[PDB]
Design a protein around this ligand. Structure first.
Ligand SMILES: *[C@H](CS(=O)(=O)c1ccccc1)[C@H](CCc1ccccc1)NC(=O)[C@H](Cc1ccccc1)NC(=O)N1CCN(C)CC1
Length: 254
């Protein structure tokens, strides 16, 4: 009937391989776009009963959405999802996977931690141009590869509402405020104690649990599988921690 004390989208739809996928946005501020295309890829898979097994292109949205902000310099969550509805997004994997219509052009790197990939550093790339043509060897026309949703919406700033929204329809995108101490997160349930504000980050909430009495959101970051708890992090649920319950945005394919 109700909300379980714990839930994990990977556990309900494990056929949907995108749910368990951790991406890397590279030396680019495209978080806004990733949490969008990630939740959408999850939700297309979930909502069509499995028939929509696709990986949507972060670069299609990052570069072609004209009302979504500043590209590699930062974006708006609501319009991103609106772009998905009116205009749609083509397929595109990552750089080192080379798949789909418009795959990501930037290589994987380490975000505030030592790993396998070369360190990201602090340079930011210019927002790619809007292509409108697929990569040479993917033959489906750009305009035909567009996958659209039927609706976009903000979810209410409401713990229980966010929970039902995830369970019934899939992961949601959400923004939160980054304070300096987040850049030192390694594991555990994150809460802002110390540090100045640096900006906002958009991520994908996949579930929630409770670790000995302590409630949390399970969140997929997009700084590759090396950062945090194998890509994922956890943050205090229930108290609008860093406004994590304020900027929740999603939509549906039908
Ligand atoms: C992503 C956050 S990030 O992954 O932590 C990141 C990546 C790279 C560098 C720094 C941080 C982007 C970062 C934006 C940015 C780029 C370059 C220098 C500094 C910052 N953040 C966003 O895209 C956020 C998304 C967001 C919106 C609302 C609430 C919470 C998160 N949006 C954003 O920064 N802007 C500013 C530009 N604009 C027109 C509105 C959206």
């Amino acid at each position: 009937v109700e909300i379980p004390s714990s839930f994990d989208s990977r556990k309900k739809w494990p056929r949907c391989k995108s749910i368990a996928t951790i991406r890397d946005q590279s030396r680019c501020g495209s978080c806004w776009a990733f949490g969008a295309v990630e939740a959408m890829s999850d939700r297309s898979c979930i909502q069509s009963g499995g028939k929509q097994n696709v990986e949507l292109s972060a670069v299609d949205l990052l570069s072609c959405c004209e009302s979504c902000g500043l590209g590699c310099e930062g974006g708006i969550l609501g319009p991103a999802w609106d772009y998905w509805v009116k205009e749609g997004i083509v397929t595109g994997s990552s750089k080192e996977n080379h798949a789909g219509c418009e795959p990501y052009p930037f290589p994987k790197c380490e975000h505030h931690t030592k790993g396998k990939y070369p360190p990201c550093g602090s340079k930011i790339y210019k927002t790619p141009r809007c292509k409108q043509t697929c990569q040479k060897k993917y033959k489906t026309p750009y305009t035909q590869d567009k996958h659209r949703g039927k609706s976009s919406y903000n979810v209410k700033n409401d713990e229980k509402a966010i929970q039902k929204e995830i369970m019934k329809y899939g992961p949601v995108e959400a923004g939160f405020t980054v304070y300096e101490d987040f850049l030192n997160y390694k594991s555990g349930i994150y809460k802002h104690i110390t540090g100045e504000t640096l900006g906002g980050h958009a991520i994908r909430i996949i579930g929630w649990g409770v670790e000995n009495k302590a409630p949390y959101w399970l969140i997929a970051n997009s700084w590759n599988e090396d950062w945090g708890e194998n890509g994922y992090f956890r943050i205090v649920r229930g108290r609008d921690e860093c406004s994590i319950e304020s900027e929740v945005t999603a939509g549906r394919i039908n």
